[PDB]
Amino acid sequence: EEEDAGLVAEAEAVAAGWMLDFLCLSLCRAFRDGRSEDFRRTRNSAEAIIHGLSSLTACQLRTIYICQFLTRIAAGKTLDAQFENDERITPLESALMIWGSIEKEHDKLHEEIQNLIKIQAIAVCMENGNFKEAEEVFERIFGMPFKSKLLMIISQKDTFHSFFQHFSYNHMMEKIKSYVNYVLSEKSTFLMKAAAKVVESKR
Amino acid sequence: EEEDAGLVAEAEAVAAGWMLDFLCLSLCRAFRDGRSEDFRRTRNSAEAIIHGLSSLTACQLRTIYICQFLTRIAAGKTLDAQFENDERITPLESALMIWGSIEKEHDKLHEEIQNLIKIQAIAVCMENGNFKEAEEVFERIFGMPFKSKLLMIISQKDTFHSFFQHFSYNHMMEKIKSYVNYVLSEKSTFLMKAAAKVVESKR
Ligand SMILES: O=C1CC(I)=CC=N1
Ligand SMILES: O=C1CC(I)=CC=N1
């Protein structure tokens, strides 16, 4: 009699884990394709779904970290976004902490993305005339060896500087898109594959 | 090449329709069992999922109406909730408009629920000392024949009145729970049934 409710709660948990995996994947494809409004709406759906879940596997937790990293990278130019209890931590600094803490291989693409997020954390502060904030951000990032170049640019206050062109926001975005592309190849969820069978069935 | 994106968007739409049906059903069971926080969290999930959808069948739309009716009934004692553009419309009046407009059979249980929502729309106004609001609500509902009894109670200002005991809030709630019980028997969604196979598989 009482085990009937336990049965239902258990099925709701399996189904919610599947919805989480579907939404995490769909958030990755939206970011990769640059569908900004879709990324926003799928983030809202993943957030509500997470509040409905009580248990999580290490793979679901890792996925949640990757999606949090993507949400923060998307808000990297929005210096008004606060993702942590410490209000001084800019959105690109918050993406960088997740990136350097995810259980993933530290390959050359990983290092490249990290160094690009670092330069851009300082660059968006200089881009909005917040020269003192760029210095504060730089202190929390240095506490890579190219810090001598960054510190020299913060003091000079040169906004449209040549260094920020080579290591551009677009370059950081493109290197991150390559990573998202790679993980998706890896990922094939129960939900995506079943719905894709219904689509091929109607062809 | 371009049809590959169309394929993905189509599968995301099928998968989102399945998530909607799962969440609508789970909202119904939470209401029926009186799991209030679960109802709140599942409502938030269904809302976000709906904002991600662009097409809907008449069956999905009807389900959305039933769930909106349940959300408003849950807030029937919350006279501070505004569900429509007209701010004067109390939550129980908003549930009553959906109830009398859903494409469903108008059986004796339907009529009973409607008449119980009507009495309670006036009763929660008298319960909070808003005697003029009960009169205003009564004007928009009458503009059953028992209106002579209701109007006589509004004028007298008798809060803990005998009429409201027979046609109690608990009675309205219980008659609505019977209805929710009945529709669930009807109810088998793709998501609930697949997750329930995984649960039986682990037994
Ligand atoms: O809390 C979260 C979860 C996910 I998935 C994305 C963003 N924030
Ligand atoms: O807009 C909505 C949808 C649903 I399902 C429940 C409540 N509000």
Numbering used by the authors:
A (entry chain A), B (entry chain A): 60 to 202, 208 to 251, 253 to 268
Give the original sentences from the paper that presented this experimental model.
TRF1 is a subunit of the shelterin complex that binds to and protects the linear ends of chromosomes known as telomeres. TRF1 binds to double-stranded telomeric repeats and mediates telomere protection, replication and extension. It is recruited to shelterin through a domain:peptide interaction between its TRF homology (TRFH) domain, also responsible for dimerisation of TRF1 (TRF1TRFH), and a short linear motif of TIN2, known as its TRFH-binding motif or TBM (TIN2TBM). Here, we report the discovery of a series of fragment hits that bind at the interface between the TRFH domain of TRF1 (TRF1TRFH) and a peptide of TIN2 (TIN2TBM), an interaction essential for the recruitment of TRF1 to shelterin, using X-ray crystallography (XChem) and ligand-observed NMR (LO-NMR) fragment screening.
To find a different crystal form of TRF1TRFH, we carried out a series of commercially available crystallisation screens and identified conditions that generated crystals in the P41212 space group, different from the original P3121 crystal system. An initial inspection of the TIN2TBM site showed that the closest neighbouring TRF1TRFH molecule in this new crystal was further away than in the previous crystal system, this time exposing both the TIN2 leucine and phenylalanine binding pockets to the solvent. Furthermore, the loop region adjacent to the leucine pocket that typically accommodates three arginine residues of TIN2 was well-resolved and closely resembled that of the published TRF1:TIN2 co-crystal structure; this was in contrast to the previous crystal system, in which F142 formed a cation-pi interaction with the sidechain of R131. In light of this, we carried out a second XChem fragment screen against the new crystal system of TRF1TRFH. PanDDA analysis of the 981 processable datasets resulted in 50 hits being identified across different sites of the protein, 28 of which were found in the TIN2TBM binding site. After refinement of the 28 PanDDA hits, 19 could be confidently assigned in the conventional electron density maps. However, unlike the hits obtained from the P3121 XChem screen, the hits from the P41212 XChem screen spanned a larger surface area of the TIN2TBM binding site, and most did not appear to form any interactions with TRF1TRFH molecules from neighbouring asymmetric units. This diversity of hit matter covering the leucine pocket and the phenylalanine pocket of the TIN2TBM peptide will provide a firm starting point for efforts aimed at linking and merging hits. Interestingly, several fragment hits originating from our second XChem screen possess alternative groups to the sulfonic acid that interact with R131 and R102, which opens up opportunities to link and merge hit matter found across the TIN2 leucine and phenylalanine binding pockets.
